[PDB]
Amino acid sequence: PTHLSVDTKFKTEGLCVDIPGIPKDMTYRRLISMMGFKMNYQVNGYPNMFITREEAIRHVRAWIGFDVEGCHGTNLPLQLGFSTGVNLVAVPTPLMYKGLPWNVVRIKIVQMLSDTLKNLSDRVVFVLWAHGFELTSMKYFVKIGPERTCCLCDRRATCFSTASDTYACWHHSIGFDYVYNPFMIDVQQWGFTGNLQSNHDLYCQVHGNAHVASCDAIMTRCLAVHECFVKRVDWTIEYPIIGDELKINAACRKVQHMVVKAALLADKFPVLHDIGNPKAIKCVPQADVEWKFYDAQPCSDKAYKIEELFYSYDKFTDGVCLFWNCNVDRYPANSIVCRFDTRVLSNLNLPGCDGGSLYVNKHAFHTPAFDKSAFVNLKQLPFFYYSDSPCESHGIDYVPLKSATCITRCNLGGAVCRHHANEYRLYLDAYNMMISAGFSLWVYKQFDTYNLWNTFT
Ligand SMILES: CCn1nccc1CNC
Ligand SMILES: [Zn+2]
Ligand SMILES: [Zn+2]
Ligand SMILES: [Zn+2]
C-alpha cells in the first residue's frame, strides 16, 4: 500500500449540497471520472490524483490549501481561493481579483503555484475541505497523464502548455497554462464532526473567516498541519535538502559550543542544567563544570511551562540553565537560550497553526509562536568570536582584520594574526547564517565579553 487505491471508498456527504443526489457509495475511480478526468488504465507513475495522509505528510512542502465558493456552476462565476491569500474570480462566459474567463485564470494559477513552489517541492498537493465545486472546477485548469520530465531540465513536469505542446517543472513554466499531474487530499475524509470553521477554531485563533475562498483555503491547510504535525509527531520522516540545511546545522553547532564555552569562562558556573533534546551531547566537552541533563522533546503545540519543567514530584537557580531550542513560556534569569523565531521568511519555514510555524530541515518540527515576553529576564546575546587556540597560520587570501569583537590573545596584544582573522570571518559567516535561518540568541543580563580578556594571562 504505497499509493492510495483508486478503489478506496470516498465519503460523499460533504459534497451533496453542491452535488445533490450524489451516490453514498463512491470510489476514487468514480469520483475522478465524475471530475471529468480519464485514467485509461495507465501504469505510468500517476496511479491516483488523491493521496494518503502518509504521502501528504512526506510532501508537506507541496501543500496548497484550495477552496472554491460560488459567487452566484457553468452558469455562475466561481471564487477560487488559495492558501497563498489569492482570490481569483472565474466566469464561464485576501487579494481579490475581478471576474475573468478560465483561459486567462489558468495562466495566473500556473504562475502563482510555480512562484510559490519552485524552491519548496517537485509537486503541488491541493489540501481540500471538499464540498463539490473545487473538484468539478479542476478540469478547467488541470491536465493529467503519464509522469513526465521538464522540457528544459530533469525535474518532473508539474505544468503543461497548450500553446507549445510541451511540459515543464515549476522553474521552467513561464507562459504555461495548465497544472499537470497535481495531487490532492480531502481533509473531510479523516473523520471530522462539524464544519471547517468549528474544527479549525478549536486549535487556532490567528486565522479568521472573512467568508472568502482564500480564508477557507488557509483554515483547511492550517487544520491539516495541526492534525499531521501538532497532535501527531513523526520525527522519523526525512525531508530532502532544498536550501542551506547542512550549513545552518553546522553553524548551530559552532555557535552553541562558542556561546556556552564563553559563558563558562566568563562567569565560571559550577553547574550547567541542560534542558531539552533527550539525545543531547555536552557541547563543551572539556569544560570543568558539572553537566546535568534534563529530557524535553521539541514542543509542537504550546511552549513548555517552566513551572512544569522544574517541578520535582535539583537547584536550577545554581549555576546556569541551557535551553538550546527548548521553547519555554518564561526563561529563568540564569539562562543561555536559542529560540527559533517562527516569523522568519524562508524556504525551510512553512506557515503553521495558531501563530506557530513548520520548520522543515531533515525533519519537520512545528514550533509554537515566537513570544518576546518569554525573554523578559534575559537580554539579546551580542555577536562575539572567542578563541584561546594558538596563533598559528598552517596552510584563500588576506586583508588585515580590525575588530573589537575578536576576543583573542593576538587582538589583546595589538594585531590580529591571520589564523584568528580567517577563523573570525568563518565564524561570523556561520553566525549570520544561523540568525538569517530564524534562530535568536538570548543570555543572562550579567554576561559580559569584557570578562573573557583575563583568560589570556
Ligand atoms: C527535574 C525535575 N523533575 N523531577 C522529576 C521530574 C521532573 C521534571 N518535571 C516534571
Ligand atoms: Zn525544468
Ligand atoms: Zn489556523
Ligand atoms: Zn591569533
Q: If you write DSSP's letter for every residue of 404-448 in order, what string do you get?
A: TTEESHHHHTSSPPHHHHHHHHHHHHHHHHHHHTTEEEEEETT--
Contact call for residues 394 and 376 (beta carbons, < 8 A): no
User: Does any ligand 1 atom lie closer than 6 A to the CB of residue 294?
Assistant: yes
CA distance 340 to 278: 18
Ligand nearest to the CA of 312: 1
Catalytically active residues, by annotation: 67, 69, 134, 211, 216
Amino acid at 307: E
Contact call for residues 427 and 258 (beta carbons, < 8 A): yes
CA of 42 to the centre of ligand 2 (A): 24
Contact call for residues 336 and 320 (beta carbons, < 8 A): yes
Contact call for residues 425 and 417 (beta carbons, < 8 A): no
Show the cell assigned to 102: 478560465
Ligand nearest to the CA of 170: 2
Structural method: X-ray
CA distance 295 to 309: 9
User: Does any ligand 1 atom lie closer than 6 A to the CB of residue 41?
Assistant: no
Q: What sections of 180-329 are H helices per DSSP?
A: 196-200, 213-225, 245-267, 306-310
The angle that helices 245-267 and 418-436 make with each other, rounded to 10 degrees, is 110
Residue having the nearest C-alpha atom to atom 8 of ligand 1? 309
Strand pairing of 349-351 and 335-340? unpaired
Question: What are the residue ranges spanned by the domains of the chain?
Answer: 13-230, 245-455
Closest CA to 123 of 172, 206, 179: 179
Q: Quick one: which H or E segment has residue 115?
A: helix 102-117
User: Does any ligand 1 atom lie closer than 6 A to the CB of residue 315?
Assistant: no
Ligand nearest to the CA of 218: 3
Show the cell assigned to 38: 480519464
Show the cell assigned to 388: 584561546
Q: Give the mutation target among 275, 294, 295 for probing the ligand 1 site: most ligand atoms within 8 A of CB.
A: 294
**What b/e string do you get for 288-319 counting C-beta neighbours within 10 Å, with b at 16 or more?**
ebebeebebebbbeebbebeebbeeeeebeeb
CA of 155 to the centre of ligand 2 (A): 6
How many Cβ atoms from other residues are within 10 Å of residue 103's Cβ?
A: 13
CA distance 245 to 256: 17
What letter would DSSP give residue 371? -
Strand pairing of 78-82 and 86-91? antiparallel
Contacts of 232 (CB under 8 A, 6+ apart): none
User: Does any ligand 1 atom lie closer than 6 A to the CB of residue 37?
Assistant: no
